[model samples]
Target: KIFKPEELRQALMPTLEALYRQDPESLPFRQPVDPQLLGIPDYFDIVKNPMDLSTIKRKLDTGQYQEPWQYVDDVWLMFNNAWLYNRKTSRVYKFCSKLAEVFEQEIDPVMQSL
Candidate 1:
């Protein structure tokens, strides 16, 4: 699931707007929050030590976090039945901006095709 961090602000936008019109001291001042599964730690030990499970866990923490995106490299290599590209460390996020495009023109389509 792909989650935009802006969702929290967007969800509160309408409620905050209504509260503003109602005058000072609103009793029902509230925003949305959902209790969700916190199962990442359970799988922590399954991964190798010093593994960058943070990339996976942080993505999982989001309601719409793309677990698939985090696993793209793993999935690509596995499905090809090929053993290449270590997943032990987080690389891309360390080097790129969140807004930066992920796919280099040459390698992105190749990942998609695989």
Candidate 2:
């Protein structure tokens, strides 16, 4: 069911407020990199709106990278109702919270092994 934006904002205020208590600098995040420098062909088309993972490789190998990194907006992926979404300003953080559990179990260790 859909909720009024005010209601959603009201219910989520505490969690959002709590974020300020954490050291923002301590957050684990990467500043975005330029697709052109990264040699990501059709990057915009592939990542438009809600994110799509159709052709993204699990990782970018060292050989593919170019010099002089350029900054861009961060990219976040969210899964809900069996559908994938690209996190954006209007998307609530809670929608992506559940996926963190799956990532903890599935994605993290695989990266650790590599």
Candidate 3:
């Protein structure tokens, strides 16, 4: 089952919004990473492919997603980057892990339905 761009966007919008509202800790992942502001000078070096919820939303709005997997891949990339850059003991990493679990829980059904 394949979703048209608009249908995909519709499906993803609510899920993305849910992620943003998941917790206050989700604030950091809501937008793109600001390496300079965050004081992580080596961020870009470690994370070659950065992703975030806001960028995903913009891509969805702009009809950038042609398939469900593309959207799924982006979501995973966002979490993967978090795990890569942050220490496992860090708060951001823990938040990211929790969010990743929630994402899987929410997205699994959507993916199965498609």
Candidate 4:
């Protein structure tokens, strides 16, 4: 469950690398590093990307950025599916919109207990 600092750095590397390669202003997002921002304060940074229950427990206790914070690209995970895909660019506010609907009915209530 304990990932090395090097591992964490490797995981977080996408932000700078991705940001540097992209054209920020021309894209739909306000910043080039939009993918890195798919995040809350990570109240529990115990686990790294693709996190699980044990990983969350560690972060809650440690108050650090653990894994399970699977890099959030925002655009693809939300859209690129059934409807609301913009042909022009990969701007996926629609994914968030659909997720909002699904979560209200499905996940939010269950996670509320946590």
The most accurate candidate by lDDT is: 3
**lDDT of all the models against the reference?**
0.29, 0.31, 0.87, 0.35
lDDT winner between 2 and 3, please give it.
3
lDDT of 4 by residue, 19-96 (tens): 223443223322322224655344224212232223323433453554424322322232222133233343434433
TM-score for every candidate vs. truth? 0.19, 0.25, 0.93, 0.27
lDDT of 1 by residue, 1-114 (tens): 343545432432232233224322221112111113333453224323222223322333454433334444432322222112213242322222211122223235433433
Cα lDDT for residue 67, candidate 2: 16
Given candidate 2, what's the lDDT at residue 2?
38
The Cα error of candidate 4 at residue 78, in Å, is 6.3
In model 4, which regions exceed 4 Å deviation? 4-6, 14-16, 24-26, 30-65, 72-85, 88-114
Better of 1 and 3 by lDDT: 3
In candidate 2, the residue pairs with backbone N, CA or C atoms under 3 Å apart (3 or more residues apart, or in different chains) clash, namely: 51-86
Candidate 1 backbone collisions, by pair: 1-64
TM-score of 3: 0.93
